[PDB]
Paper text:
Non-ribosomal peptide synthetases are important enzymes for the assembly of complex peptide natural products. To address this, we report the structure and biochemical characterization of complexes of a [name] domain bearing a stable analog of the acyl acceptor complexed to the acceptor site of a C domain from the NRPS that biosynthesizes fuscachelin in the thermophile [name].
Mass spectrometric analysis of the PCP2-C3 didomain construct revealed a 340 Dalton mass increase, consistent with attachment of PPant to S2514, likely installed by the phosphopantetheinyl transferase EntD that phosphopantetheinylates some [name] domains when they are expressed in E. coli. Interestingly, we found that this did not extend into the active site of the C domain, but instead curled back towards the outer surface of the C domain.
Author numbering: 2481 to 2550, 2557 to 2999
Protein backbone atom coordinates (compact mmCIF):
# COMPACT_ATOMS: atom_id res chain seq x y z
CA UNK A 1 0.00 0.00 0.00
CA UNK A 2 1.66 3.20 -1.22
CA UNK A 3 -0.81 5.34 0.79
CA UNK A 4 1.11 4.71 4.02
CA UNK A 5 4.24 6.00 2.31
CA UNK A 6 2.53 9.24 1.16
CA UNK A 7 1.15 10.22 4.58
CA UNK A 8 4.54 9.65 6.25
CA UNK A 9 6.04 12.04 3.68
CA UNK A 10 3.19 14.45 4.45
CA UNK A 11 3.98 14.36 8.18
CA UNK A 12 7.75 14.62 7.67
CA UNK A 13 7.16 17.73 5.55
CA UNK A 14 4.82 19.38 8.06
CA UNK A 15 7.08 18.73 11.07
CA UNK A 16 10.41 19.59 9.41
CA UNK A 17 8.68 22.36 7.39
CA UNK A 18 10.47 21.27 4.20
CA UNK A 19 9.46 20.41 0.63
CA UNK A 20 12.23 17.85 0.13
CA UNK A 21 10.78 14.48 1.22
CA UNK A 22 11.16 11.46 -1.06
CA UNK A 23 10.47 7.85 -0.11
CA UNK A 24 14.17 7.24 0.63
CA UNK A 25 14.86 10.52 2.48
CA UNK A 26 16.31 9.82 5.92
CA UNK A 27 14.45 11.67 8.67
CA UNK A 28 17.55 12.30 10.80
CA UNK A 29 19.68 13.26 7.79
CA UNK A 30 16.85 15.70 6.98
CA UNK A 31 17.41 17.73 10.16
CA UNK A 32 15.09 15.77 12.44
CA UNK A 33 15.87 14.93 16.06
CA UNK A 34 14.13 13.18 18.94
CA UNK A 35 12.04 16.17 20.08
CA UNK A 36 10.44 16.47 16.64
CA UNK A 37 10.42 12.67 16.32
CA UNK A 38 7.67 12.52 18.97
CA UNK A 39 5.64 15.07 16.99
CA UNK A 40 5.97 12.80 13.96
CA UNK A 41 4.77 9.69 15.80
CA UNK A 42 2.01 11.63 17.59
CA UNK A 43 0.66 12.85 14.24
CA UNK A 44 0.98 9.39 12.66
CA UNK A 45 -1.03 7.87 15.52
CA UNK A 46 -3.80 10.39 14.80
CA UNK A 47 -3.85 9.91 11.01
CA UNK A 48 -3.17 6.19 10.70
CA UNK A 49 -5.00 3.99 13.15
CA UNK A 50 -1.82 2.37 14.41
CA UNK A 51 0.51 2.43 17.40
CA UNK A 52 3.76 4.15 16.39
CA UNK A 53 6.64 5.19 18.60
CA UNK A 54 10.10 6.67 18.28
CA UNK A 55 11.21 3.02 18.26
CA UNK A 56 9.78 2.60 14.75
CA UNK A 57 11.27 5.90 13.54
CA UNK A 58 14.74 4.96 14.82
CA UNK A 59 14.82 1.60 13.03
CA UNK A 60 12.96 2.82 9.93
CA UNK A 61 13.97 6.46 9.40
CA UNK A 62 12.66 6.79 5.84
CA UNK A 63 9.02 7.04 4.70
CA UNK A 64 9.32 3.87 2.59
CA UNK A 65 10.89 1.87 5.42
CA UNK A 66 8.49 3.29 8.02
CA UNK A 67 5.49 2.52 5.80
CA UNK A 68 6.57 -1.10 5.26
CA UNK A 69 7.25 -1.55 8.98
CA UNK A 70 3.71 -0.39 9.83
CA UNK A 71 4.84 -11.58 6.73
CA UNK A 72 8.25 -12.82 5.60
CA UNK A 73 10.65 -10.85 3.45
CA UNK A 74 11.08 -11.97 -0.14
CA UNK A 75 13.86 -14.56 -0.35
CA UNK A 76 15.93 -15.46 -3.38
CA UNK A 77 15.44 -19.04 -4.52
CA UNK A 78 18.13 -21.15 -6.14
CA UNK A 79 19.38 -20.92 -9.72
CA UNK A 80 17.36 -24.02 -10.64
CA UNK A 81 14.17 -22.68 -9.08
CA UNK A 82 11.14 -23.22 -11.33
CA UNK A 83 8.92 -20.24 -12.16
CA UNK A 84 5.84 -19.55 -10.03
CA UNK A 85 2.77 -17.67 -11.23
CA UNK A 86 1.33 -15.17 -8.78
CA UNK A 87 -2.42 -15.07 -8.26
CA UNK A 88 -2.26 -11.71 -10.06
CA UNK A 89 -0.90 -13.43 -13.17
CA UNK A 90 -3.41 -16.29 -12.94
CA UNK A 91 -6.31 -13.82 -12.78
CA UNK A 92 -5.04 -11.86 -15.79
CA UNK A 93 -4.58 -15.07 -17.78
CA UNK A 94 -8.10 -16.13 -16.80
CA UNK A 95 -9.56 -12.80 -17.99
CA UNK A 96 -8.01 -13.37 -21.43
CA UNK A 97 -9.68 -16.80 -21.58
CA UNK A 98 -13.16 -15.56 -20.63
CA UNK A 99 -13.17 -12.32 -22.63
CA UNK A 100 -12.03 -10.95 -25.98
CA UNK A 101 -10.21 -7.95 -24.53
CA UNK A 102 -8.86 -6.53 -27.83
CA UNK A 103 -5.71 -5.51 -25.99
CA UNK A 104 -7.42 -3.85 -23.01
CA UNK A 105 -4.87 -5.42 -20.64
CA UNK A 106 -1.82 -4.30 -22.60
CA UNK A 107 0.00 -1.34 -21.09
CA UNK A 108 1.94 1.11 -23.31
CA UNK A 109 5.02 3.17 -22.53
CA UNK A 110 5.97 5.58 -25.30
CA UNK A 111 9.02 7.87 -25.29
CA UNK A 112 9.77 10.55 -27.86
CA UNK A 113 13.48 10.43 -28.69
CA UNK A 114 15.16 13.37 -30.42
CA UNK A 115 17.50 11.03 -32.35
CA UNK A 116 16.58 7.95 -34.34
CA UNK A 117 17.90 5.02 -32.31
CA UNK A 118 20.05 2.25 -33.75
CA UNK A 119 17.81 -0.79 -34.25
CA UNK A 120 20.57 -3.39 -33.77
CA UNK A 121 21.76 -1.79 -30.53
CA UNK A 122 18.14 -1.47 -29.38
CA UNK A 123 17.43 -5.15 -30.09
CA UNK A 124 20.56 -6.15 -28.16
CA UNK A 125 19.51 -3.92 -25.26
CA UNK A 126 16.05 -5.54 -25.15
CA UNK A 127 17.69 -8.97 -24.93
CA UNK A 128 19.66 -7.72 -21.92
CA UNK A 129 16.45 -6.37 -20.39
CA UNK A 130 14.67 -9.69 -20.93
CA UNK A 131 17.64 -11.67 -19.59
CA UNK A 132 17.67 -9.55 -16.42
CA UNK A 133 13.91 -9.75 -15.70
CA UNK A 134 12.62 -13.34 -15.74
CA UNK A 135 9.00 -12.16 -15.72
CA UNK A 136 9.60 -10.66 -19.18
CA UNK A 137 10.45 -14.09 -20.66
CA UNK A 138 7.93 -16.24 -18.77
CA UNK A 139 5.24 -17.78 -20.96
CA UNK A 140 1.89 -19.05 -19.71
CA UNK A 141 0.64 -22.29 -21.24
CA UNK A 142 -2.74 -23.95 -20.82
CA UNK A 143 -2.79 -27.42 -19.28
CA UNK A 144 -5.50 -29.71 -17.94
CA UNK A 145 -4.93 -28.37 -14.42
CA UNK A 146 -4.87 -24.74 -15.53
CA UNK A 147 -2.20 -22.19 -16.44
CA UNK A 148 1.43 -23.10 -15.91
CA UNK A 149 4.51 -20.88 -16.21
CA UNK A 150 7.23 -21.59 -18.76
CA UNK A 151 10.50 -19.70 -18.21
CA UNK A 152 12.38 -19.24 -21.47
CA UNK A 153 16.14 -19.35 -21.14
CA UNK A 154 17.83 -16.08 -22.22
CA UNK A 155 19.15 -17.72 -25.39
CA UNK A 156 15.68 -19.12 -26.18
CA UNK A 157 13.67 -15.91 -25.64
CA UNK A 158 12.89 -14.50 -29.08
CA UNK A 159 12.55 -10.75 -28.55
CA UNK A 160 10.11 -8.79 -30.72
CA UNK A 161 11.82 -5.57 -31.84
CA UNK A 162 11.00 -3.78 -35.09
CA UNK A 163 10.97 -0.40 -36.80
CA UNK A 164 7.65 0.86 -38.21
CA UNK A 165 7.12 3.85 -40.50
CA UNK A 166 4.24 6.18 -39.67
CA UNK A 167 1.96 6.95 -42.61
CA UNK A 168 -0.71 9.00 -40.84
CA UNK A 169 -0.59 10.59 -37.39
CA UNK A 170 1.63 8.81 -34.89
CA UNK A 171 -0.85 9.07 -32.00
CA UNK A 172 -3.40 6.76 -33.62
CA UNK A 173 -0.55 4.47 -34.71
CA UNK A 174 0.65 4.16 -31.09
CA UNK A 175 -2.79 3.05 -29.89
CA UNK A 176 -3.03 0.60 -32.79
CA UNK A 177 0.34 -1.00 -32.03
CA UNK A 178 -0.57 -1.10 -28.32
CA UNK A 179 -3.85 -2.98 -28.84
CA UNK A 180 -2.29 -5.82 -30.86
CA UNK A 181 -2.85 -9.08 -28.94
CA UNK A 182 -0.22 -11.22 -27.24
CA UNK A 183 -0.26 -15.00 -27.53
CA UNK A 184 0.88 -15.66 -23.96
CA UNK A 185 1.60 -19.33 -24.75
CA UNK A 186 4.10 -18.57 -27.55
CA UNK A 187 5.22 -14.90 -27.31
CA UNK A 188 7.09 -13.19 -24.49
CA UNK A 189 4.86 -10.53 -22.90
CA UNK A 190 6.96 -7.63 -24.22
CA UNK A 191 6.84 -5.86 -27.59
CA UNK A 192 9.16 -3.02 -28.66
CA UNK A 193 8.55 -0.74 -31.64
CA UNK A 194 10.57 2.22 -32.93
CA UNK A 195 8.26 4.59 -34.82
CA UNK A 196 9.98 6.67 -37.50
CA UNK A 197 8.84 8.82 -40.39
CA UNK A 198 9.21 12.21 -41.99
CA UNK A 199 6.50 13.75 -39.79
CA UNK A 200 8.36 12.68 -36.62
CA UNK A 201 11.60 14.31 -35.48
CA UNK A 202 13.86 11.51 -34.26
CA UNK A 203 11.68 8.57 -33.25
CA UNK A 204 9.05 7.40 -30.78
CA UNK A 205 10.08 4.35 -28.75
CA UNK A 206 7.03 2.29 -27.74
CA UNK A 207 7.24 -0.47 -25.14
CA UNK A 208 4.11 -2.63 -24.88
CA UNK A 209 3.77 -5.13 -22.05
CA UNK A 210 0.95 -7.45 -21.25
CA UNK A 211 -0.18 -6.63 -17.72
CA UNK A 212 0.73 -10.21 -16.73
CA UNK A 213 4.35 -8.99 -16.72
CA UNK A 214 4.16 -5.30 -15.75
CA UNK A 215 2.10 -2.69 -13.92
CA UNK A 216 2.47 1.08 -14.24
CA UNK A 217 5.08 1.20 -11.47
CA UNK A 218 7.35 -0.82 -13.79
CA UNK A 219 7.76 2.15 -16.16
CA UNK A 220 10.70 3.62 -14.24
CA UNK A 221 12.78 0.41 -13.91
CA UNK A 222 11.96 -0.57 -17.52
CA UNK A 223 13.25 2.76 -18.87
CA UNK A 224 16.19 2.87 -16.47
CA UNK A 225 17.40 -0.63 -17.34
CA UNK A 226 16.76 -0.24 -21.08
CA UNK A 227 18.76 3.01 -21.00
CA UNK A 228 21.62 1.29 -19.16
CA UNK A 229 21.69 -1.60 -21.64
CA UNK A 230 21.39 0.64 -24.72
CA UNK A 231 24.34 2.88 -23.81
CA UNK A 232 26.39 -0.18 -22.84
CA UNK A 233 25.61 -2.03 -26.09
CA UNK A 234 26.33 1.11 -28.11
CA UNK A 235 29.84 0.99 -26.61
CA UNK A 236 30.06 -2.70 -27.56
CA UNK A 237 29.73 -4.22 -24.09
CA UNK A 238 27.14 -6.02 -22.02
CA UNK A 239 25.72 -3.90 -19.18
CA UNK A 240 27.47 -3.93 -15.80
CA UNK A 241 24.56 -5.10 -13.67
CA UNK A 242 24.17 -5.69 -9.98
CA UNK A 243 21.89 -8.76 -9.98
CA UNK A 244 18.28 -8.39 -8.94
CA UNK A 245 17.54 -8.80 -5.22
CA UNK A 246 14.55 -10.94 -6.25
CA UNK A 247 12.83 -12.29 -9.33
CA UNK A 248 9.07 -12.07 -9.70
CA UNK A 249 8.78 -15.83 -9.07
CA UNK A 250 10.54 -15.30 -5.73
CA UNK A 251 7.92 -12.73 -4.73
CA UNK A 252 5.06 -14.96 -5.92
CA UNK A 253 6.38 -18.00 -4.02
CA UNK A 254 6.90 -16.04 -0.79
CA UNK A 255 3.47 -14.41 -1.09
CA UNK A 256 1.59 -17.67 -1.74
CA UNK A 257 3.32 -19.48 1.15
CA UNK A 258 2.33 -16.64 3.48
CA UNK A 259 -1.24 -16.29 2.17
CA UNK A 260 -2.12 -19.92 2.87
CA UNK A 261 -5.34 -21.78 2.16
CA UNK A 262 -8.84 -20.34 2.26
CA UNK A 263 -9.85 -23.49 4.17
CA UNK A 264 -7.37 -22.69 6.97
CA UNK A 265 -9.14 -20.47 9.55
CA UNK A 266 -5.77 -19.20 10.82
CA UNK A 267 -4.46 -18.34 7.36
CA UNK A 268 -4.11 -14.65 6.45
CA UNK A 269 -6.19 -15.38 3.34
CA UNK A 270 -9.24 -16.71 5.22
CA UNK A 271 -9.02 -13.96 7.85
CA UNK A 272 -8.86 -11.20 5.23
CA UNK A 273 -11.64 -12.82 3.19
CA UNK A 274 -13.79 -12.86 6.32
CA UNK A 275 -13.25 -9.11 6.66
CA UNK A 276 -14.36 -8.52 3.07
CA UNK A 277 -17.45 -10.76 3.31
CA UNK A 278 -18.77 -8.59 6.13
CA UNK A 279 -17.55 -5.29 4.64
CA UNK A 280 -19.31 -5.98 1.31
CA UNK A 281 -22.60 -7.33 2.68
CA UNK A 282 -25.74 -6.10 0.88
CA UNK A 283 -23.67 -4.54 -1.89
CA UNK A 284 -25.51 -3.06 -4.90
CA UNK A 285 -25.22 -5.07 -8.09
CA UNK A 286 -24.50 -1.82 -9.94
CA UNK A 287 -24.97 1.92 -9.56
CA UNK A 288 -27.70 3.93 -11.28
CA UNK A 289 -25.50 6.01 -13.59
CA UNK A 290 -26.69 8.05 -16.60
CA UNK A 291 -25.52 6.16 -19.68
CA UNK A 292 -26.17 6.76 -23.36
CA UNK A 293 -26.91 3.09 -24.15
CA UNK A 294 -28.01 0.09 -22.08
CA UNK A 295 -25.53 -2.56 -21.04
CA UNK A 296 -24.99 -4.86 -24.05
CA UNK A 297 -25.27 -8.63 -23.88
CA UNK A 298 -21.51 -9.04 -24.49
CA UNK A 299 -18.69 -6.77 -23.36
CA UNK A 300 -16.63 -5.43 -26.26
CA UNK A 301 -13.96 -3.72 -24.09
CA UNK A 302 -14.04 -0.81 -26.54
CA UNK A 303 -13.32 2.49 -24.89
CA UNK A 304 -12.16 6.06 -25.19
CA UNK A 305 -10.23 8.61 -23.15
CA UNK A 306 -11.59 11.98 -22.06
CA UNK A 307 -9.09 14.36 -20.49
CA UNK A 308 -9.57 17.32 -18.16
CA UNK A 309 -6.62 19.63 -17.62
CA UNK A 310 -6.00 20.90 -14.11
CA UNK A 311 -4.46 24.36 -13.66
CA UNK A 312 -1.29 24.21 -11.52
CA UNK A 313 -3.06 26.41 -8.96
CA UNK A 314 -5.86 23.84 -8.64
CA UNK A 315 -3.38 20.96 -8.32
CA UNK A 316 -1.66 22.85 -5.50
CA UNK A 317 -5.00 23.60 -3.81
CA UNK A 318 -5.91 19.90 -3.89
CA UNK A 319 -2.53 19.06 -2.35
CA UNK A 320 -3.06 21.62 0.41
CA UNK A 321 -6.60 20.38 1.10
CA UNK A 322 -5.26 16.84 1.56
CA UNK A 323 -2.46 17.97 3.89
CA UNK A 324 -4.79 20.12 6.00
CA UNK A 325 -7.24 17.23 6.47
CA UNK A 326 -4.60 14.50 6.87
CA UNK A 327 -5.59 12.47 3.79
CA UNK A 328 -3.84 11.58 0.55
CA UNK A 329 -4.52 13.26 -2.78
CA UNK A 330 -6.06 9.97 -3.92
CA UNK A 331 -8.53 10.17 -1.04
CA UNK A 332 -9.60 13.67 -2.10
CA UNK A 333 -10.15 12.45 -5.67
CA UNK A 334 -11.96 9.34 -4.43
CA UNK A 335 -14.30 11.47 -2.30
CA UNK A 336 -14.88 13.81 -5.25
CA UNK A 337 -15.84 10.90 -7.52
CA UNK A 338 -18.23 9.63 -4.84
CA UNK A 339 -19.81 13.10 -4.60
CA UNK A 340 -20.11 13.21 -8.40
CA UNK A 341 -21.90 9.86 -8.66
CA UNK A 342 -24.06 10.80 -5.66
CA UNK A 343 -25.20 14.03 -7.34
CA UNK A 344 -25.91 11.99 -10.49
CA UNK A 345 -28.39 9.88 -8.51
CA UNK A 346 -26.37 6.78 -7.57
CA UNK A 347 -27.48 6.83 -3.92
CA UNK A 348 -25.67 6.89 -0.59
CA UNK A 349 -23.75 3.59 -0.97
CA UNK A 350 -20.92 4.16 -3.46
CA UNK A 351 -18.49 1.27 -4.10
CA UNK A 352 -15.37 2.37 -6.02
CA UNK A 353 -12.68 -0.04 -7.16
CA UNK A 354 -9.09 0.97 -6.68
CA UNK A 355 -5.69 -0.63 -7.41
CA UNK A 356 -3.27 -1.01 -4.50
CA UNK A 357 0.37 -1.90 -5.10
CA UNK A 358 1.95 -4.68 -3.02
CA UNK A 359 5.46 -3.25 -3.30
CA UNK A 360 6.40 -2.58 0.33
CA UNK A 361 9.27 -5.12 0.32
CA UNK A 362 12.62 -3.54 -0.56
CA UNK A 363 13.33 -6.44 -2.93
CA UNK A 364 10.36 -5.54 -5.19
CA UNK A 365 9.78 -1.82 -4.47
CA UNK A 366 11.50 -0.73 -7.70
CA UNK A 367 11.35 -3.85 -9.92
CA UNK A 368 9.41 -5.01 -12.99
CA UNK A 369 6.20 -6.95 -12.45
CA UNK A 370 2.49 -6.78 -11.71
CA UNK A 371 1.81 -6.00 -8.04
CA UNK A 372 -1.66 -4.37 -8.14
CA UNK A 373 -4.53 -5.91 -6.22
CA UNK A 374 -7.98 -4.39 -6.68
CA UNK A 375 -9.88 -3.34 -3.55
CA UNK A 376 -13.54 -2.37 -3.27
CA UNK A 377 -13.63 0.95 -1.39
CA UNK A 378 -17.21 1.37 -0.17
CA UNK A 379 -18.07 5.01 0.57
CA UNK A 380 -21.24 5.89 2.49
CA UNK A 381 -22.75 9.35 1.93
CA UNK A 382 -25.87 9.11 4.13
CA UNK A 383 -26.65 11.87 6.61
CA UNK A 384 -25.65 14.63 4.10
CA UNK A 385 -22.10 15.23 5.38
CA UNK A 386 -19.76 18.05 4.48
CA UNK A 387 -16.82 17.36 2.18
CA UNK A 388 -14.54 17.44 5.24
CA UNK A 389 -16.75 14.84 6.95
CA UNK A 390 -16.57 12.70 3.81
CA UNK A 391 -12.77 12.90 3.81
CA UNK A 392 -12.89 11.50 7.35
CA UNK A 393 -15.24 8.72 6.24
CA UNK A 394 -13.07 7.89 3.22
CA UNK A 395 -9.88 7.77 5.30
CA UNK A 396 -11.52 5.33 7.72
CA UNK A 397 -12.86 3.14 4.90
CA UNK A 398 -9.52 3.20 3.08
CA UNK A 399 -7.36 2.41 6.11
CA UNK A 400 -9.51 -0.56 7.15
CA UNK A 401 -9.39 -1.81 3.56
CA UNK A 402 -5.62 -1.33 3.23
CA UNK A 403 -5.10 -3.55 6.28
CA UNK A 404 -6.69 -6.42 4.31
CA UNK A 405 -5.16 -5.63 0.91
CA UNK A 406 -3.73 -9.11 0.25
CA UNK A 407 -7.03 -10.94 -0.35
CA UNK A 408 -7.05 -11.59 -4.12
CA UNK A 409 -9.92 -9.81 -5.83
CA UNK A 410 -11.07 -13.04 -7.49
CA UNK A 411 -11.29 -14.74 -4.09
CA UNK A 412 -13.24 -11.77 -2.71
CA UNK A 413 -15.69 -12.12 -5.62
CA UNK A 414 -16.10 -15.85 -4.94
CA UNK A 415 -16.54 -15.11 -1.22
CA UNK A 416 -19.13 -12.35 -1.72
CA UNK A 417 -20.88 -14.32 -4.52
CA UNK A 418 -22.57 -11.39 -6.31
CA UNK A 419 -25.02 -11.82 -9.20
CA UNK A 420 -22.69 -12.01 -12.18
CA UNK A 421 -22.87 -10.72 -15.74
CA UNK A 422 -20.35 -10.94 -18.56
CA UNK A 423 -21.08 -7.30 -19.46
CA UNK A 424 -20.55 -5.95 -15.93
CA UNK A 425 -17.50 -5.94 -13.71
CA UNK A 426 -18.37 -7.55 -10.36
CA UNK A 427 -18.64 -5.58 -7.11
CA UNK A 428 -17.73 -2.27 -8.79
CA UNK A 429 -17.91 -0.69 -12.24
CA UNK A 430 -16.19 2.66 -11.51
CA UNK A 431 -12.49 2.69 -10.66
CA UNK A 432 -10.52 5.61 -9.23
CA UNK A 433 -6.73 5.59 -9.19
CA UNK A 434 -3.82 7.92 -8.55
CA UNK A 435 -0.77 7.60 -10.78
CA UNK A 436 2.63 9.29 -10.96
CA UNK A 437 4.75 9.04 -14.10
CA UNK A 438 8.53 8.63 -13.88
CA UNK A 439 10.75 11.60 -13.16
CA UNK A 440 14.23 12.17 -14.62
CA UNK A 441 13.50 10.42 -17.91
CA UNK A 442 14.26 13.49 -20.04
CA UNK A 443 17.81 12.52 -21.13
CA UNK A 444 17.64 8.82 -22.00
CA UNK A 445 19.83 7.04 -24.57
CA UNK A 446 22.17 10.03 -24.74
CA UNK A 447 19.43 12.12 -26.37
CA UNK A 448 16.49 14.37 -25.44
CA UNK A 449 13.46 12.35 -24.37
CA UNK A 450 9.94 12.96 -23.12
CA UNK A 451 7.01 10.67 -22.38
CA UNK A 452 4.13 10.81 -24.87
CA UNK A 453 0.61 9.72 -24.00
CA UNK A 454 -1.13 6.89 -25.87
CA UNK A 455 -4.87 7.37 -26.62
CA UNK A 456 -6.52 4.14 -25.52
CA UNK A 457 -9.14 2.49 -27.72
CA UNK A 458 -10.09 0.09 -24.89
CA UNK A 459 -11.61 0.13 -21.42
CA UNK A 460 -11.68 -2.37 -18.54
CA UNK A 461 -14.71 -1.07 -16.61
CA UNK A 462 -17.67 1.27 -17.06
CA UNK A 463 -15.60 4.26 -15.88
CA UNK A 464 -12.04 4.72 -14.67
CA UNK A 465 -11.07 8.12 -13.28
CA UNK A 466 -7.31 8.56 -12.96
CA UNK A 467 -5.56 11.49 -11.32
CA UNK A 468 -2.30 11.33 -13.28
CA UNK A 469 0.76 13.35 -12.32
CA UNK A 470 3.53 13.73 -14.84
CA UNK A 471 7.13 13.31 -13.76
CA UNK A 472 7.50 17.12 -13.54
CA UNK A 473 4.73 18.72 -11.46
CA UNK A 474 1.71 18.85 -13.75
CA UNK A 475 -1.47 16.83 -13.36
CA UNK A 476 -4.68 16.00 -15.20
CA UNK A 477 -7.70 13.73 -14.83
CA UNK A 478 -8.08 10.98 -17.42
CA UNK A 479 -11.46 9.27 -17.73
CA UNK A 480 -11.30 5.88 -19.45
CA UNK A 481 -14.91 5.09 -20.37
CA UNK A 482 -16.65 2.11 -21.93
CA UNK A 483 -17.72 3.16 -25.43
CA UNK A 484 -20.62 0.68 -25.24
CA UNK A 485 -22.22 2.84 -22.54
CA UNK A 486 -21.02 6.43 -23.07
CA UNK A 487 -20.55 8.81 -25.96
CA UNK A 488 -17.32 10.81 -25.98
CA UNK A 489 -19.07 14.11 -25.22
CA UNK A 490 -20.85 12.60 -22.21
CA UNK A 491 -17.45 11.51 -20.90
CA UNK A 492 -15.96 14.96 -21.51
CA UNK A 493 -18.86 16.36 -19.48
CA UNK A 494 -18.37 13.83 -16.67
CA UNK A 495 -14.67 14.63 -16.28
CA UNK A 496 -15.41 18.37 -16.42
CA UNK A 497 -18.00 17.89 -13.67
CA UNK A 498 -15.38 16.10 -11.54
CA UNK A 499 -13.05 19.10 -11.88
CA UNK A 500 -15.89 21.36 -10.75
CA UNK A 501 -16.43 19.17 -7.68
CA UNK A 502 -12.72 19.49 -6.86
CA UNK A 503 -12.83 23.28 -7.30
CA UNK A 504 -15.80 23.59 -4.95
CA UNK A 505 -14.24 21.23 -2.39
CA UNK A 506 -11.00 23.22 -2.19
CA UNK A 507 -12.80 26.58 -2.07
CA UNK A 508 -15.07 25.56 0.83
CA UNK A 509 -14.94 22.00 2.18
CA UNK A 510 -17.42 22.88 4.96
CA UNK A 511 -20.42 22.78 2.61
CA UNK A 512 -22.70 19.73 2.55
CA UNK A 513 -22.46 17.34 -0.38
P1 LIG B 1 17.06 11.81 20.53
O1 LIG B 1 17.64 10.48 20.10
O2 LIG B 1 17.37 12.96 19.60
O3 LIG B 1 17.87 12.20 21.87
C1 LIG B 1 17.99 11.33 23.01
C2 LIG B 1 19.46 11.30 23.42
C3 LIG B 1 20.31 10.96 22.21
C4 LIG B 1 19.79 12.69 23.91
C5 LIG B 1 19.93 10.38 24.57
O4 LIG B 1 20.07 11.10 25.82
C6 LIG B 1 19.18 9.07 24.75
O5 LIG B 1 18.27 8.71 24.02
N1 LIG B 1 19.57 8.26 25.72
C7 LIG B 1 18.68 7.14 25.90
C8 LIG B 1 19.26 5.92 25.20
C9 LIG B 1 19.35 4.71 26.10
O6 LIG B 1 19.81 4.78 27.22
N2 LIG B 1 18.88 3.60 25.54
C10 LIG B 1 18.14 2.60 26.27
C11 LIG B 1 18.75 1.22 26.06
S1 LIG B 1 19.95 0.87 27.37
Amino acid sequence: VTAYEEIVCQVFAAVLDRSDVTADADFFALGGHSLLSLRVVARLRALLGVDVGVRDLFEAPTPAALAARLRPAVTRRGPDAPPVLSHFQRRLWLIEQVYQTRGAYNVPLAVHVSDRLDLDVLRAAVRDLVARHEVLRTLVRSSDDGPDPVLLAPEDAAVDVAEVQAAGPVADLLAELTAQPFDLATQIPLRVRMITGEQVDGCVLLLVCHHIAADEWSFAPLLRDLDTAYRARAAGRAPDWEPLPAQYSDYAATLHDWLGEATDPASPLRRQLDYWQHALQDLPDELDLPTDRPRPATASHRGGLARAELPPELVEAVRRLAAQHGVTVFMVVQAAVAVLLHRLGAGDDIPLGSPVADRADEAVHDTVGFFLNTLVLRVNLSGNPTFADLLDRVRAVDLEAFARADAPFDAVVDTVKPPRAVSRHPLFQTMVSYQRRPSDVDRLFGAATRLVEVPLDTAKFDLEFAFIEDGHGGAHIALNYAADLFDHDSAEQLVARLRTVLEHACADPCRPV
